[PDB]
Design a protein around this ligand. Structure first.
Ligand SMILES: [Cl-]
Lengths: 592, 590
């Protein structure tokens, strides 16, 4: 029930100072952190950068694999000019679980390590003095929290995780920490939808505030020129001769919201950039601004060698440099909400994102049978609400993914899907498509939930998990056989392939190819391309993965996952040049 | 005296002595004073054929320089009493003395051409006998290939070559025990002419007696199509199947000694291809049509045998060269095992046969007292090479130096002499040439009148104008190509080295030197240049596969300029040539 997830801005009514830097850090295996006073703060631990996953900074494995309570400590200054304002610490992500103490006093908890949350500390600090913030984070996985997984205990006592997902359990203060001072009466939320008529457009907005003061809304273009204004919390901004936002061709207008009448100084100002564009599913078409498009891309994680799962602006800007070069125009934020700065860059660069909530693991290799479904569901729907509230105004969000590879064959999955889909059908004012990925075991013959998603996202791995090597010929025929069945039943919704590919160890070559070589990656991708091109209802290809990424140790995991088109260092495998050639030859309206 | 390859029939036997010999180093030079020439069994087992270097875990052995000893027992059949008995050594790198049953039979200089020892009177027919080989692998400016031997401050001897490849040494090729007739074929020659659909093989036969000679040619199905009598003669082949590039057809030649009445005294058989080679101004003509050369760039180098011939690697190297569209290669920088040419003959490849005249330059050379003995051994190894490989249809040209220092005006007497003393050795009179290094250019080279066609070694984008400078390196190469064109070049030009070290697995966007992408970028550049000039009639890239090399800070475990890895898998540049070369016809530029 987060009152507001607006991204921090700086103006005369709102301040935002980052608390990033080095913190004190201590493990707590015994769980006696609070018994012995760590919540008042400490400086007898190890320095830990923020934001950063804490796991890879340690040379010993038990610390890399640590599972339990852990503590971050820091001092921060509160200016005396802040007295009277609404004061918040905004945590952009604490994986997975956090209790926040300021000066020894408990402020709040939070569940879910991938969305932001703020702590009202207005009453917990001395103004004009140094205060202390302590974070008691937790790490464990259970089937009652997203991402789904288990926590086991080695015979020697140490806890460790057995995830139901691929990626590594990178943990800790994974994203920035802000100190905010906001007006007492302020903007909490706003919403935008768009309509196009001829060369003109209309933004339809609403604004939520914690009070009754008047609301002025003003829309300015790229050069600061005001082009529409309106009064009140509902309204319609008329933009004549609009500059539409276009795939791989962004145009962003600045939106400005202010509280007060013209006898006041503005009691609050908020500011955000939005793109004027519309998204419709029509038949099997995905329409952006009423012309069909064809998705090309990935397939991503937030993973980097030094930050773990933490947001790094350098790695993010290179991922976009690469993705623009290679011809992509879309990617899915698998398998969890990304740092907010990523959606701002997709807006700036004209990319189409599939925003995913962290519901991986709904799949035991009897899931929906059990009793952890009650608590799991609360957290799932709550994480879906907060995700849609945070990112709804980004032009680059195209669709919401509400599961990843859930067990759709279990008939008991249908009551759960009915509930999730019912409870979310109206969260997004733009009413974009809501979907999920179907795993390989989940086909037109075996899935029970094919009626729900607004378009289809298939995860197919012929040539890797099935029909590998010289059997690849049988795998293509068996995929063509499935795609034949969709066609017969007459798919009325678009189909998008969202995973496929091949683990590839850069530098491994063979002629002829063998699984794991660079040549085999290309043969596999060429094979998929031949299938995609032979069916009109296939409307996009998102390969797995963009880069190689870290993973839980295992005998099938050559240090992480290696399915990337690029290495973890962000350099290209042979498959990168394949797609660089294919994707820059496919137009935006491919198949139409 | 005879370098014919061994064959098996009723007059001639041939049995390999390959396998595990005994082996000992002789750093002191006491082996003969110690009685080792009588054979020994107190050393280490060593495969033959194979270089001995890579079988030792200590660097002192791997790098050993000096006298080393091989010893083996072998059985001489009773049935062989009365024939000419021979130990034939296919290659002993670089120097050998041969002992049988402790008796010194013969010595040999040069480590890449075969020699035979007559052991007819040194054996006990019907029992075991001993063969011991005393080898040496020192280098000096008086032997090919050229280099120096130094002593370290700790006494140990170490080689410092004037060439790139590693000093792989020992019994690098098979050892045969031969049984030959007392009167036998020693040599033969072939030359060809064409006329319509008919051809003429012009042969001669060298013998060590006066018995009559009888030559017959049969086609691939065994049908006889021409006979002749006499030590000189001409076989008339009606409606001949010509030997074509990447399209071989081989006739079987059979030489037989003795008149129509006696038991046959000797039989010798070989496989030849009917085809002609002419340099017509600026074209290379095979069967009177112009060709365009594409290929490598090779070494005899494999992980486990070293320099030694390994038939598995050779058939694999050939499988790859056909896959990639190539049709030629140069046996840099020394004659190869004789099997390489027979496969070349069966696969219709064109070979440039190179004598180990490498390292004739320092970092001058033709201004030293070593030339006199160097030249002795040089023109002798030229004679042995042409005598051995004459009759192969697949040998296109002879290469008499690799990267000699032709800038000094003193190279000119020596070239003059080498080129006069080889003038009339090859009966087919194929073109004689050599490679010009980066420093030897139209502006600076003093031996440009000698070669029959020009072989160019250029490394823009690697040893000069690397990295972002590559564009200035391309411009300089076209500069030099403009000056050749200005100088009115009348002989053909073939690029025979160019390329870039590449560590398989190193990727960068944009590229940096040593990555797979940069190599493709460099090879594309050279291609752009080659295609804008008509006198350029061939591209032989360096190198086919990563090969081993002396240790140095620029050698990342050997040379890495190879299109394929030392294990013979492709780098990205493999697929660039696979695309390009399989689209250039055999008559590109005509
Ligand atoms: Cl206070």
């Amino acid at each position: 029930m987060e009152t507001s997830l607006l991204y921090p801005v700086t103006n005369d009514q709102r301040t935002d100072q980052k608390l990033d830097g080095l913190w004190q850090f201590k493990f707590d295996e015994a769980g006696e952190g609070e018994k012995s006073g760590w919540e008042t703060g400490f400086h007898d631990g190890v320095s830990m950068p923020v934001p950063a996953s804490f796991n890879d900074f340690f040379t010993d494995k038990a610390s890399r694999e640590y599972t339990g309570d852990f503590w971050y400590s820091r001092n921060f200054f509160v200016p005396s000019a802040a007295k009277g304002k609404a004061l918040f610490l905004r945590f952009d992500a604490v994986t997975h679980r956090a209790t926040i103490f300021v000066n020894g006093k408990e402020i709040r908890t939070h569940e879910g390590g991938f969305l932001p949350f703020a702590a009202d500390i207005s009453e917990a600090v001395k103004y004009g003095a140094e205060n202390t913030v302590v974070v008691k984070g937790n790490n464990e996985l259970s089937r009652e929290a997203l991402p789904a997984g288990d926590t086991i205990t080695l015979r020697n006592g140490k806890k460790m995780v057995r995830p139901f997902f691929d990626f590594y359990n990178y943990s800790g203060l994974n994203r920035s920490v802000h100190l905010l001072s906001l007006p007492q009466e302020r903007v909490l939320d706003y919403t935008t939808t768009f309509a196009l008529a001829g060369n003109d457009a209309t933004v339809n907005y609403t604004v939520e505030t914690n009070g009754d003061a008047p609301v002025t809304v003003s829309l300015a273009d790229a050069d600061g020129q005001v082009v529409a204004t309106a009064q009140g919390k509902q309204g319609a901004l008329q933009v004549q001769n609009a500059h539409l936002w276009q795939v791989r061709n962004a145009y962003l207008y600045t939106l400005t919201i202010q509280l007060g009448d013209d006898t006041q100084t503005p009691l609050d100002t908020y500011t955000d950039r939005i793109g004027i564009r519309t998204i419709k599913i029509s038949g099997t078409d995905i329409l952006v601004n009423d012309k069909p498009i064809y998705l090309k891309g990935f397939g991503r994680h937030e993973d980097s060698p030094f930050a773990g799962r933490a947001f790094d602006l350098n790695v993010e800007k290179k991922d976009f440099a690469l993705m623009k070069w290679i011809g992509a125009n879309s990617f899915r934020t698998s398998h969890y909400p990304y740092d907010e700065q990523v959606y701002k860059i997709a807006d700036e660069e004209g990319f189409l994102l599939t925003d995913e909530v962290p519901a991986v693991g709904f799949k035991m290799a009897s899931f929906f049978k059990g009793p952890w479904l009650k608590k799991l569901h609360e957290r799932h729907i709550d994480q879906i609400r907060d995700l849609i509230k945070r990112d709804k105004n980004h032009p680059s969000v195209l669709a919401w993914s509400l599961f990843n590879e859930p067990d759709t064959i279990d008939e008991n999955a249908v009551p759960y899907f009915k509930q999730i889909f019912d409870e979310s059908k109206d969260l997004d004012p733009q009413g974009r498509p809501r979907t999920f990925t179907l795993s390989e075991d989940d086909t037109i013959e075996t899935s029970k939930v094919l009626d729900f998603p607004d378009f289809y996202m298939l995860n197919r791995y012929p040539g890797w998990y099935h029909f590998g090597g010289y059997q690849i010929s049988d795998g293509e025929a068996g995929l063509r056989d499935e795609m034949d069945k969709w066609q017969k039943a007459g798919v009325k919704k678009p189909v998008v392939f969202t995973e496929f590919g091949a683990d590839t160890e850069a530098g491994l070559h063979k002629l002829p190819s063998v699984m794991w070589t660079e040549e085999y990656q290309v043969e596999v991708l060429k094979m998929f391309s031949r299938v995609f091109d032979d069916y009109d209802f296939i409307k996009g290809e998102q390969v797995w993965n963009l880069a190689d990424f870290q993973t839980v140790e295992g005998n099938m995991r050559v240090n992480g996952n290696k399915k990337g088109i690029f290495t973890r260092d962000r350099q290209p495998k042979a498959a990168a040049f394949f797609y660089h050639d294919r994707w820059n030859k496919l137009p935006l309206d491919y198949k139409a």
